[PDB]
Design a protein around this nucleic acid. Structure first.
Ligand code: MG
Ligand code: MG
Ligand code: MG
Ligand code: MG
Ligand code: MG
Ligand code: MG
Ligand code: MG
Ligand code: MG
Ligand code: MG
Ligand code: MG
Ligand code: MG
Ligand code: MG
Ligand code: MG
Ligand code: MG
Ligand code: MG
Ligand code: MG
Ligand code: MG
Ligand code: MG
Ligand code: MG
Ligand code: MG
Ligand code: MG
Ligand code: MG
Ligand code: MG
Ligand code: MG
Ligand code: MG
Ligand code: MG
Ligand code: MG
Ligand code: MG
Ligand code: MG
Ligand code: MG
Ligand code: MG
Ligand code: MG
Ligand code: MG
Ligand code: MG
Ligand code: MG
Ligand code: MG
Ligand code: MG
Ligand code: MG
Ligand code: MG
Ligand code: MG
Lengths: 142, 14, 110, 56, 103, 47, 117, 150
RNA sequence: CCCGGCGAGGGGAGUGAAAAAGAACCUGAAACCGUGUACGUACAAGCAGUGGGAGCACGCUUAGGCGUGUGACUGCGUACC
RNA sequence: UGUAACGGGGCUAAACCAUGCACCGAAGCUGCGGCAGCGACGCUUAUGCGUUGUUGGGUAGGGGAGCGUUCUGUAAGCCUGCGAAGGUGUGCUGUGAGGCAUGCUGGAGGUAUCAGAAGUGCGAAUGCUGACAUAAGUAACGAUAAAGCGGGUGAAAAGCCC
């Protein structure tokens, strides 16, 4: 017999709300990425997206230890010969707080079409309110 | 053909 | 049912004749004749002559009724090339290919 | 100046994906003679907008 | 109703009436072979896990067929070292139909 | 019969053919090694 | 005796071009490119008959880890507990049961937990 | 190969593979690399080896009952019909008749039967003895052959 | 006989065992170039395969699936001499 | 050139030290199936083991065993117009070179077996010959002395004739 493989049409995905208030960025992100990839399910198939949809609330209230509040720097290149730009963790949180969680989880996710599809299931929000009440998301304390 | 032109001289790497 | 007309060894490049032949495919022969009439291509002249020969073969050998007749198939195969010599600068010689094509039009009542 | 690899049938057809001819969208029927013609062009018998203009 | 038993150095989870491809057995093509080393019985919710083997678990099967699998092509190649080597392989199997599972 | 005669075993040795692929052993330098005097055609020193 | 090599050469090239089917461009059309593509396909098949066993074992292990953590134990503790309980079931069957019979997998988990206790 | 010894093109400067002869065996219409010469393929057979092979072949024919010994084998006229009827009487189709000394009548009669040969006792060979299904020797032929093979 | 320029070329007819034997003529390979159909492909990065693998199309069967084509996604993977 | 001196995310333990128990992890070892080499031992004859231990990465290179091609004998045999060789698919089959069968095409040759001989096997040699690609429907259309219009002929006229 061949081993079971999850089928994209049959895969059932659930909705969860996580509150990032006071959570350590990286550990919250590891749990987020694991559940987005679907490794918490016995049906986990590496080429199928078996993960769940996760709403992340209060992304601006995520925590970092040490001096990472000021010392952690996010670099990106704009594609122009001087275009190396950087923002500290504070500036990232102030300007776009959801980008912090999203960048962490995107780094922890696989790289490729399936990793991008998985990332599309993350719904980071800066505040305590989301608009996916229609999806009936269950509270996930991770 | 019957006539092959001499190739142009290389850059004088001297 | 289906009627073929071919212009074999048509003195034209298959690429250009294919440009013209893509215009009339699965179209009624009337629309195709209009299109080839108002296409400004030597290949359009060639393909129109072949399509008219096909319509005539259909109405003379296979039955009748130009009206119920579409260009079901049309394709352009490459034919034999004529090799020519062209002198270039400094004693060099290139080979020109006078490329030809076989134009085939299959009309049908479907 | 010259290629380092020969391009493929795929690249060749992708480049020629813009070479396709556009057929004339519609022909005009003459007011008087009822002949087909291009918009704003006389017919093959010399009519334009219902009047004999050339008499060729 | 399924049972887990090891036959050819590897284990199989089988149900009654289903056909299983094993490594080659030394049994004729119409004989009943018994695997009395069943690692597990399920029978719905009454799951018997065997401490190494279930005590009375026995899987009776009928040797349906002997055969050779699809030909695999072994290709060994050392680039720039003037060495290549090709080999064929058809692995022998015994297909058996599970006729009975007695816990 | 004229088609049922056979040579003794070990009587014919089947000959050694150079430069006929990888599997044959010999092939690509046919047992000459690599570039040198003795690998050349008509090469090798006198007695 | 002059030997012409057209029939044998054609057969030998067709043999390779038939294995090169489905390959892109010259890889399926042209013997020089097709022959290299078939040799590397054979190399890859040889290497991947090994990597297949590796990949399936790591898939089974990931699924057993998921189901065991659903039951409240890590993969390493679960496997240690099954070793202590003398359960010989392998990772292939364990992952099959994890997917298809969650009750039997919970039974195996309780057995491993009892062996660890 | 017919042709001149001129270098087809100069050694350097052209982007062409270096050539020296239009008659090169790499070239179409060039020479054969190791062209055949008329050679003699006949090999030596030791007298004793040849005679031992003849003795072995005759022994094998006797063991296989392919050797038929007779007195006189003659035909009264050079008639293929006569010899064919005689062989059909003797139940023979593919036969090698070895006679004491060659009879002109028998030779002429056998000349047109392709499954029938007629040798002199001195003119027997291993390939014929093995190739014909039956070997009919006269008594004089048998005596001459045993003298020749002693 | 028909289309065509009293063309080229072709479609019929007829000859012939055969005309994809029509003289550009036995067979008629490959490269190369097309038409049609099935599947895939316009958010995805690299020797283009290989291991896994859904879906779809088609051919069977008894209903388990098998075969054929394609191949989303995914692990690994920098040609040959 | 751009973070650019953890592979990255990220980590205050997911760092380091110490102790311990688990687990993962290779083509290593074990399990099951298969093939081959060598040795020992019996089997008595020559080989097969109903045995057995062990070995089996490999360039240069040495040794051993084969496949297939053309031609000669076997062969005035055998196959073949109820379809040969060749071509093109399919299925089966062998450890491999390969083989076998068969559909379509083809239209007259082919050849068992066992021997014999080799112009006996190609991807490379800036190889040779032919064919066909690519660049590409691109550059160019050869003096910047220059054309315009009317009529004619013609299937068609910027270019021919007037
Ligand atoms: Mg990776
Ligand atoms: Mg000049
Ligand atoms: Mg274009
Ligand atoms: Mg040597
Ligand atoms: Mg060398
Ligand atoms: Mg050296
Ligand atoms: Mg040397
Ligand atoms: Mg010959
Ligand atoms: Mg010659
Ligand atoms: Mg002598
Ligand atoms: Mg005609
Ligand atoms: Mg034919
Ligand atoms: Mg003939
Ligand atoms: Mg032909
Ligand atoms: Mg072809
Ligand atoms: Mg995007
Ligand atoms: Mg897409
Ligand atoms: Mg790309
Ligand atoms: Mg892949
Ligand atoms: Mg810098
Ligand atoms: Mg372990
Ligand atoms: Mg392993
Ligand atoms: Mg090993
Ligand atoms: Mg073993
Ligand atoms: Mg070895
Ligand atoms: Mg060697
Ligand atoms: Mg022949
Ligand atoms: Mg056909
Ligand atoms: Mg040769
Ligand atoms: Mg080579
Ligand atoms: Mg070459
Ligand atoms: Mg060119
Ligand atoms: Mg081009
Ligand atoms: Mg350009
Ligand atoms: Mg330009
Ligand atoms: Mg220009
Ligand atoms: Mg100009
Ligand atoms: Mg000019
Ligand atoms: Mg004028
Ligand atoms: Mg002018």
């Amino acid at each position: 017999m061949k081993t079971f493989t999850a089928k994209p049409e049959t895969v059932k995905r659930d909705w969860y709300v996580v509150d990032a208030t006071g959570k350590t960025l990286g550990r919250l992100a590891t749990e987020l990425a694991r559940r987005l990839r679907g490794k918490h399910k016995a049906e986990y198939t590496p080429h199928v997206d078996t993960g769940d949809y996760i709403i992340v609330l209060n992304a601006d209230k995520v925590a970092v230890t040490g001096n990472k509040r000021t010392d952690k720097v996010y670099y990106h290149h704009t594609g122009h010969i001087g275009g190396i730009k950087q923002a500290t963790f504070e500036e990232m949180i102030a300007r776009r707080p959801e980008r912090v969680i999203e960048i962490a989880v995107k780094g922890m996710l696989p790289k490729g079409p399936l990793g991008r599809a998985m990332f599309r299931k993350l719904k980071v929000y800066a505040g305590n309110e989301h608009n996916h009440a229609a999806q009936q998301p269950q509270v996930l304390d991770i | 053909p019957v006539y092959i032109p001499r190739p142009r001289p290389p850059h004088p790497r001297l | 049912m289906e009627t073929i007309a071919k212009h074999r060894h048509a003195r034209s490049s298959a690429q250009k004749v294919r440009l013209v032949a893509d215009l009339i495919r699965g179209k009624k022969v009337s629309q195709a004749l209009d299109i080839l009439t108002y296409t400004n291509k030597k290949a359009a002249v060639l393909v129109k002559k072949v399509l008219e020969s096909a319509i005539a073969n259909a109405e003379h050998n296979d039955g009748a009724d130009i009206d119920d007749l579409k260009v079901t198939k049309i394709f352009v195969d490459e034919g034999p090339s004529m090799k020519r010599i062209m002198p270039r600068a400094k004693g060099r010689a290139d080979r020109i290919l006078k490329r030809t094509s076989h134009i085939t039009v299959v009309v049908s009542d479907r | 100046a010259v290629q380092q690899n020969k391009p493929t049938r795929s690249k060749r057809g992708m480049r020629r994906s813009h070479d396709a001819l556009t057929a004339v969208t519609s022909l005009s029927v003459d007011k008087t003679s009822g002949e087909k013609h291009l918009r704003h062009h006389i017919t093959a018998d010399g009519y334009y907008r219902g009047r004999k203009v050339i008499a060729k | 109703m399924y049972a887990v038993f090891q036959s050819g150095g590897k284990q199989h989870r089988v149900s009654e009436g289903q056909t299983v491809r094993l490594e080659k057995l030394d049994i004729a093509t119409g004989e009943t072979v018994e695997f009395a080393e069943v690692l597990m019985i399920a029978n719905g919710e009454e799951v018997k896990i065997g401490v190494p083997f279930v005590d009375g678990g026995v899987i009776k099967a009928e040797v349906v067929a002997h055969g050779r699998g699809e030909k695999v092509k072994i290709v060994k190649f050392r680039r720039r070292k003037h060495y290549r080597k090709q080999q064929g392989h058809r692995q022998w199997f015994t297909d058996v139909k599970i006729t009975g599972i007695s816990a | 019969r004229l088609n049922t005669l056979s040579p003794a075993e070990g009587s014919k040795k089947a000959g050694k053919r150079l430069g006929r692929g990888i599997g044959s052993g010999l092939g690509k330098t046919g047992g000459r090694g690599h570039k040198g005097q003795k690998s050349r055609s008509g090469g090798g020193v006198r007695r | 005796a002059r030997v012409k090599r057209g029939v044998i050469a054609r057969a030998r090239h067709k043999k390779i071009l038939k294995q090169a089917k489905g390959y892109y461009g010259a890889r399926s059309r042209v013997y020089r490119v097709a022959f290299q593509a078939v040799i590397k396909a054979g190399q890859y098949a040889y290497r991947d008959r090994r990597q297949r066993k590796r990949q399936f074992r790591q898939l089974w292990i990931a699924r057993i880890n998921a189901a065991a953590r659903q039951n409240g134990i890590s993969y390493s503790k679960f496997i240690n507990g099954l070793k202590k309980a003398s359960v010989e079931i392998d990772r292939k069957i364990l992952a099959d049961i994890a997917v298809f019979d969650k009750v039997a997998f919970t039974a195996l988990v309780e057995k491993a937990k009892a062996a660890l206790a | 190969v017919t042709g001149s010894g001129k270098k087809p093109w100069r050694q350097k400067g052209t982007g062409r593979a270096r050539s020296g002869s239009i008659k090169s065996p790499i070239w179409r219409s060039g020479g054969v690399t190791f062209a055949a010469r008329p050679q003699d393929h006949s090999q030596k057979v030791n007298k004793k080896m040849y005679r031992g092979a003849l003795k072995s072949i005759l022994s094998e024919l006797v063991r296989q009952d392919r050797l038929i010994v007779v007195e006189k084998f003659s035909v009264e006229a050079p008639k293929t019909k006569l010899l064919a009827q005689k062989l059909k009487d003797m139940a023979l189709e593919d036969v090698l008749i070895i006679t004491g000394e060659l009879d002109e009548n028998l030779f002429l009669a056998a000349r047109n039967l392709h499954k029938v040969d007629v040798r002199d006792a001195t003119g027997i060979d291993p390939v014929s003895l093995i190739a014909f299904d039956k070997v009919v020797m006269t008594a004089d032929a048998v005596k001459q052959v045993e003298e020749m093979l002693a």
